[PDB]
């Protein structure tokens with residue numbers, strides 16, 4: 001009897017799983033929201049921002065109206081190479097953004113030391129990809145890497161149709177500290193990463209006024225063989241493709257149809273993405289330069305606050321945020337947490353939600369969210385930035401691991417605004433001027449210098465309908 005080769009296993013459940021980390025795909029947890037779990041691992045934050053020069057440019061007329069198509073292509077070309085490196089070195093990519101991706105190696109505590117060595121080697125090989133590389137002629141693409149190690153809590157929150165996840169805690173705050181001081185071509189170790197690592201492997205230098213450390217060199221001992229060392233490390237790596245599946249980048253590529261699993265996983269993914277996955281919309285339809293309004297919501301908590309207090313508060317906030325976004329036709333594109341703040345990157349416009357008064361409505365949605373979230377137990381401060389303009393939208397990443405992502409100066413501006421103008425709703429000139437609203441609904445603000453933004457134009461506070 002013939003034995004034909006198995007065909008390409010390209011099921012919906014596999015396609016959905018490309019949009020999610022192993023943390024979620026193989027997580028099997030309770031239906032309760034919030035859900036929290038606790039573990040240890042190593043985090044790697046790869047800063048891919050070295051391409052502001054790109055996204056702006058691609059809206060230029062020289063791109064003959066194929067700006068978004070070209071941008072997705074060149075971006076995924078570079079990011080795909082980063083993603084293969086992470087996956088091959090046994091990491092789990094948690095999330096992508098316009099400025100970054102974040103990857104996890106989850107391990108038992110005893111193995112933290114050895115996995116840090118794996119992750120440092122990975123980092124150095126990532127820098128290696130970009131040593132003589134440039135987006136065009138004479139404009140250089142390099143990355144910056146922050147690494148951390150230690151305790152990690154995971155939070156899953158959401159409702160009956162939508163789910164969202166975050167990591168929080170020691171290693172997350174640490175990787176933020178590490179990435180904030182990393183420069184081009186750096187690999188920075190958090191203080192705890194430096195405390196836990198194998199100091200005989202690496203030579204570091206101190207970073208002035210900092211307990212975080214920079215890697216100069218990975219100098220292994222005489223008898224060290226990385227491939228043998230890596231193989232021993234894989235003993236502790238639950239889902240590393242192996243045996244008959246060692247030719248695959250992810251075990252998730254082997255997922256078989258399972259309606260209960262797919263029902264759970266699809267809740268993390270946008271309906272417009274599911275449509276493409278089900279071959280009910282063209283595969284290139286979501287790559288676009290689109291005029292949108294970004295509403296970037298920051299929920300701050302006190303230093304005292306741990307996961308078990310944060311979780312219910314984010315859940316309560318979320319339940320209100322989603323109800324407002326549903327009304328005013330908005331989407332949560334991303335959720336992030338760093339600097340004691342859980343942020344929601346919300347978007348008005350873009351896939352099929354393109355309704356007029358996008359601007360008045362974005363402002364009122366923002367105020368509604370601000371007023372409600374301010375009353376949530378344990379939420380110390382709410383801050384919301386609102387910016388409107390042309391942004392890149394697209395599925396970013398590798399074939400086997402990618403996410404729908406929004407990229408552009410308006411995204412970055414909204415993010416700085418909520419950070420540098422805490423406790424209020426702020427908006428940019430486009431939103432202000434384009435709103436069908438009287439001037440006294442606003443307050444014109446002092447110009448601040450915001451790290452990673454140049455010439456923001458006049459910024460305003462959305463005061464609201466009344467003096468109060």
Ligand SMILES: Nc1nc(Cl)cc(-c2nn(C(F)F)cc2Cc2ccccc2OCCN2CCOC[C@H]2CO)n1
Pocket residue numbers: 045094095096097098099100101102165166167168172173175176179335336337338415
């Ligand atoms: N807390 C948390 N949990 C998960 Cl599962 C993912 C993230 C996360 N992913 N990504 C990105 F790479 F896609 C970013 C984050 C937030 C984050 C966590 C630790 C350290 C830094 C960090 O984000 C850096 C700031 N960057 C700039 C300002 O806007 C928010 C953020 C996302 O682009 N954060």
